[PDB]
Amino acid sequence: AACPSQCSCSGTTVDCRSKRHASVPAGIPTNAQILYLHDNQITKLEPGVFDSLINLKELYLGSNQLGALPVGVFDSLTQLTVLDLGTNQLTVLPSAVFDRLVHLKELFMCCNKLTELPRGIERLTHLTHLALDQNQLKSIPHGAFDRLSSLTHAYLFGNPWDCECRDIMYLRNWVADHTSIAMRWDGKAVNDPDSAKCAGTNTPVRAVTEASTSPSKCP
Ligand SMILES: CC(=O)N[C@@H]1[C@@H](O)[C@H](O[C@@H]2O[C@H](CO)[C@H](O)[C@H](O)[C@H]2O[C@@H]2O[C@@H](C)[C@@H](O)[C@@H](O)[C@@H]2O)[C@@H](CO)O[C@@H]1O
């Protein structure tokens, strides 16, 4: 199998994990279906880097040093079912970055510096797994999970949820109403609807009473 240096390839799998890559390898085989780039030292993605990988189904970019995604970086990846961006340095994502990714089933974004739910995620109707843990989220916009009707795993822990602000009630009610899909991480997925906790009080978000919140406490 054609294969870049410091990767191992078999079939349509290109495995470049844990090989000290400082950049995405050149010449990634265009027939690739699974691409492991996780646990490297990749500090950026060049615009258009994945444009040729039209058959790609799974892309793992976790545990790198990414601070941004190029506009349209995943647009060619219409067959993509798994995307892992966890453990990077992402702050804000391009608004349209998920617009062509309706086939996506698993989207992992823990352990970044996200302060809002990225735009577009609410339209990814096929998601079964969505990981937002250990970011800087304070709330979830009203209705944002309403069409994610296939979800089985939602990771929301490790965020400083602002339980004083009335905007938290959407998430409060959502967690309360979907207890079976709220997951914590004990080195594995463990169902725990108390795992999303209020900033400061470290009380469960789902237990928050409407009356304890206020629409005047929403910076
Ligand atoms: C290629 C691959 O499978 N990578 C996985 C990676 O996604 C895992 O990260 C965990 O993902 C889940 C969602 O499925 C939760 O978001 C976990 O919090 C997350 O783990 C976090 O990152 C890892 C690297 C550790 O630091 C962990 O302690 C954090 O909570 C990891 C889990 O080990 O396996 C992979 O590398």
Give the CATH number of the domain where residue 185 resides. Answer: 3.80.10.10
**Beta sheet of 34-36, edge-to-edge order:** 8-10, 13-15, 34-36, 58-60, 82-84, 106-108, 129-131, 153-155, 182-185, 189-191
CA distance 54 to 160: 38
95 neighbors 122 (Cβ within 8 angstroms): no
How many domains does the chain fold into? 1
- Cα separations in angstroms, 113 against 20, 117, 137, 207: 23, 11, 9, 26
Resolution in A, one decimal? 1.7
Q: How far is the CA of 96 from the centre of ligand 1 (A)?
A: 25
Residues whose CB falls within 8 Å of the CB of residue 164, separated by 6 or more in sequence, listed in order: 212, 213, 214, 217
Name residues contacting ligand 1 (CB within 6 A).
Answer: 38, 60, 62-63, 84, 86-87, 108, 110-111, 131, 133, 155, 185
- Domain extent for 167: 1-219
